[PDB]
Amino acid sequence: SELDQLRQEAEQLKNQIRDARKACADATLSQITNNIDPVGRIQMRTRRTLRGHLAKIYAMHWGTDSRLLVSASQDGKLIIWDSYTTNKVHAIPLRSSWVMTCAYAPSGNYVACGGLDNICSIYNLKTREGNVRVSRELAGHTGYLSCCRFLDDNQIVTSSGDTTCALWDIETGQQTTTFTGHTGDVMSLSLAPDTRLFVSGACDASAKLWDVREGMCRQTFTGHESDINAICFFPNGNAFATGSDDATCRLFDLRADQELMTYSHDNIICGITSVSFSKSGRLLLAGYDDFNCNVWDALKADRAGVLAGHDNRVSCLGVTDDGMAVATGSWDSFLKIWN
Amino acid sequence: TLSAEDKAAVERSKMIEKQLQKDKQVYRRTLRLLLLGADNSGKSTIVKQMIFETKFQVDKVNFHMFDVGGQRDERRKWIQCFNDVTAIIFVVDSSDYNRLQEALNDFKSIWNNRWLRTISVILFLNKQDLLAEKVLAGKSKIEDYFPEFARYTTPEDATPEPGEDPRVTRAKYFIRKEFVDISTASGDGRHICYPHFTCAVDTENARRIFNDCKDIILQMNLREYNLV
């Protein structure tokens, strides 16, 4: 009876949580931003096409200098491109061909990748020998790992498909903190601009806000109806946008603790694979399974443009730190720059 | 208007592209096979008698077979990675009858997957020596688990091995029929199923995978050449 008593107490606390969320709902984001003049039809054209990969591209990441970018593909290679001149700066062969994530360090020295081998491999680019040598392999996850994000040169947050995230210290190799609490495969994560708390979306239609320093889940966000497989912070770190398999994006809010706005259209029935914001925070770009990307007005829920031109499913998407480009990589082994 | 360092960076990029073209020439002529099945299937004793990855060769053709078993039971999220493989090798322990409907449900879940809508399945009905011994024993009947076996007679168009009882042949062709009923009810022309019977000490498995992949690529070539 104690199991049933604690279950009744847990559902009563979920009821009072929903009560506290509905108490603070005084308006709608589509209601306050009625008077804003709209964006207009945006025509972003393809500037560069980067053609070097042999199989489907699964992840990319921009460098912090907004010029170099790393990209990982299922033939078992990372390629580091100079996106201004389309030069291949580096070509790193991987030990396992099944790579599902990619990360470029914010200092430029290191690159991380991982996949179905349950191992986050970390590669040192600036060696004294001229080649890209594997710095170290972090191995403590029991499922495949889905997303990597560097914090420093020495610590990295890893999402995995054994319903858990982790914080690794690379100088040692042992994971310092384990963030348990999900129930499905954690598909993506996104760090705050000050990198002291991050957010994660899993396959149980739930997004959790973890604190990096202490280690507890701070908040939980439950609005979707399928697997959240993309997440990205608003540029001031007080909101985020999730994309799932139910053809909807939506914008959750950290301070009001609830969803603000849904980005969906009735002619869209395929799932979102990738989500990012622009530099000011108005163009929520989202990659879909119908082979193109959509630019949603992040204040009106209006659609404002299409970036078509990929023959296959758009798998990865990213905006530079100066806001001057958008790179989309897809399953037809191509990356494309748009502004 | 390039500089000296810019021209040398372009030359480095060109040599990287040369090595990538050699890697494409190697990668195009190899055959990836997603191997799966249940825990009692004898799935690993097929590939040890012929570990994530495994490479082998039949008539100077390279096969690269990979068993993904390091994760948990939810296969619904990593199986999007293998949607351009050559074939799926599904291994079934066909001697324990109480775990046979689970294998049929798993085969129905794989055959009707939305990422595997163009992937053919090579089906190995493993451990038929135990099936022959359990049928010739007569202590475990198949109509306790599959009652339509009380009404099933073996067809005259079968190919019985030399020495087979009619009872073993009836059991074998009933199990094969139970899988090809699922395989012939969806996706006609997009992908086929190739059912083979296998022992534990059987040695013809690499030749069987070779012949079935030959037929798979022949049908893919008939489709893509506007020729079907």
Partner: single-chain antibody
Framework: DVQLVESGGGLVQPGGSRKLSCSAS????????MHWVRQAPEKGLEWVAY????????YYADTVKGRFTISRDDPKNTLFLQMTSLRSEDTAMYYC??????????????WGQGTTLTVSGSDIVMTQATSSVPVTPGESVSISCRSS???????????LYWFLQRPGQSPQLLIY???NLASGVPDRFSGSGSGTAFTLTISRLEAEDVGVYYC?????????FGAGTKLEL
């Protein structure tokens, strides 16, 4: 450990022939472009040859064009310089230099040991007008190097390199592309300048910072050095 060691020097009669070779132990030799850079017995140092990565590009100075040749052996990890028609102006010391080129790389970073060889025009004129500046330990010294053509390329990079040669050994890359410090240099060196006028500044100069400092342009081939600026106590 990264090292280049060259041999094949010695005394040669004039007009003859001689071969030099540097063996490279400790780095990926097949992806580094290679240079031969020589230095007269009492004068500053000058650039004689360059072979590319994969040998797809070979450049020579005008003095040795036609009578020298340079060739690499990538499995055996060696670089050769075959010299025919030797004059008495080829008495020098020869250095084997590695240099790798991509976006943000550090060319000319490691220099060889040097063979002592004894024998019996629309350029970029790099001008270092000084020859000797007296120093005291714990003072900031500024060394100028004036170009003739503007080294500021249209892509923003200003190709100017500063090397240090201590008394008794091979040069060492201090700064590259007029601002960036090389890996392993103390942070007291700083590179300033614009277009044609450049400055290397040493703050709180120690006793191991003595030698001759060379500036080198990498905007166009041939790569022209400076005359050096000695720093004695």
């Amino acid at each position: 450990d990264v090292q280049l060691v060259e041999s094949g020097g010695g005394l040669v009669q004039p007009g003859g022939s001689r071969k030099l070779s540097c063996s490279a132990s400790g780095f990926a030799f097949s992806s580094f472009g290679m240079h031969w850079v020589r230095q007269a017995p009492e004068k500053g140092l000058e650039w004689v040859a360059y072979i590319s990565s994969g040998s797809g590009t070979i450049y020579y100075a005008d003095t040795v064009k036609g009578r020298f040749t340079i060739s690499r052996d990538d499995p055996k990890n060696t670089l050769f310089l075959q010299m025919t028609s030797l004059r008495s102006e080829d008495t020098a010391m020869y250095y084997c230099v590695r240099s790798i080129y991509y976006y943000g790389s550090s060319p000319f970073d490691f220099w060889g040991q040097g063979t002592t060889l004894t024998v019996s025009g629309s350029d970029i004129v790099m001008t270092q007008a000084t020859s000797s500046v007296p120093v005291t330990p714990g003072e900031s010294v500024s060394i100028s190097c004036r170009s003739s053509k503007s080294l500021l390329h249209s892509n923003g990079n200003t190709y100017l390199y500063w090397f240090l040669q201590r008394p008794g050994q091979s040069p060492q890359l201090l700064i590259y592309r007029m601002s960036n410090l090389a890996s392993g240099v103390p942070d007291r060196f700083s590179g300033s300048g614009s277009g044609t006028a450049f400055t290397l500044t040493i703050s709180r100069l120690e006793a191991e910072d003595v030698g001759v400092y060379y500036c080198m342009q990498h905007l166009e081939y041939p790569l022209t050095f400076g005359a050096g600026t000695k720093l004695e106590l």
